[PDB]
Every structure is written in structure tokens, then in C-alpha cells.
């Protein structure tokens, strides 16, 4: 889990999008006003959604 603040995340958004796809990990970007988000690769999101279903 990468942790970055909002300003760094915006300053380096493309690099972070590349990194979460290349490394299959995630970024929590922090905010001063309790609006944190997590950024993950779309392929990881889709993979995790699939294993959530009871097969």
C-alpha cells in the first residue's frame, strides 16, 4: 500500500496510475477533510470482484 497526500497524488497522477497497474498494489491518497480514497488497477478490481462470488 502506497500512501500519498492529495497534492502529491495530483502532481503525479499518471505515474501512480502506471504504478498500481505495473505493481498490482494500491495508493491511499489522504486529505485534510476526511475524504481519503484508494486507487487500484482496474484489472485488480475486476479480478477481486470475480473471487467475491461463491463459485
Amino acid at each position: 500500500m502506497i500512501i500519498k497526500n492529495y497534492s502529491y497524488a495530483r502532481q503525479n497522477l499518471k505515474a501512480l496510475m502506471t504504478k498500481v497497474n505495473d505493481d498490482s498494489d494500491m495508493v491511499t491518497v489522504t486529505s485534510t477533510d476526511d475524504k481519503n480514497v484508494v486507487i487500484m488497477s482496474e484489472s485488480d478490481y475486476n479480478s477481486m470482484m470475480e473471487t467475491l462470488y461463491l463459485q
Binding site: D22, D23, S24, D25, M40, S43, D44, S47, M48, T51
Partner: protein, 87 residues
């Protein structure tokens, strides 16, 4: 461009599985192998980690959120212990 890779028997079967049923995994594994060959065990894509305990001497990179490429490098020769999580 054409690499010589050592697989454990169990990692070979899992790679074969992916070759049949999941081409995206094979492509990802191959990109990790290229990175390992170009930059060494600890540098490059996949979040390389140095493993501990009885896995000491081996490294892991992320294939995706679930699966790990567990490998070592013997004088620039890559060996794969695992490329798929076993339940």
C-alpha cells in the same frame, strides 16, 4: 528476447494452466521475467520483496492482487518456485 527459465515441477504445471486458460497471466509473468532479467532480483515492476524464513534466498513479485511470482536468480539464471497461489 528468448530467455532460459528454470521452473519447479509445480510452477511448471501452473504456468501450463495459465497458457491454456489465462493468457493475461502468462503475459504478465513474462513481463516480470523480462524485468528480473534486465534489472536483477530487487529492481523493477511488480513490487519486489525479499522473502524471509525458510523462503530466504527467494523473492516475490506480484502477478496480480492474488498471485505471486516466487523466484530466485542464480548468476543471471532465473528459477521459478511458484507463479500461482495454492489453496
Amino acid at each position: 528476447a528468448r530467455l532460459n527459465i528454470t521452473f519447479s515441477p509445480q510452477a511448471f504445471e501452473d504456468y501450463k494452466y495459465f497458457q491454456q486458460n489465462d493468457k493475461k497471466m502468462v503475459k504478465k509473468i513474462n513481463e516480470l521475467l523480462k524485468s528480473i532479467d534486465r534489472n536483477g532480483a530487487l529492481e523493477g515492476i511488480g513490487k519486489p520483496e525479499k522473502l524471509k524464513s525458510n523462503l530466504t534466498g527467494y523473492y516475490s513479485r506480484r502477478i496480480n492482487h492474488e498471485h505471486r511470482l516466487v523466484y530466485t536468480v542464480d548468476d543471471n539464471h532465473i528459477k521459478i518456485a511458484s507463479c500461482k497461489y495454492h489453496y
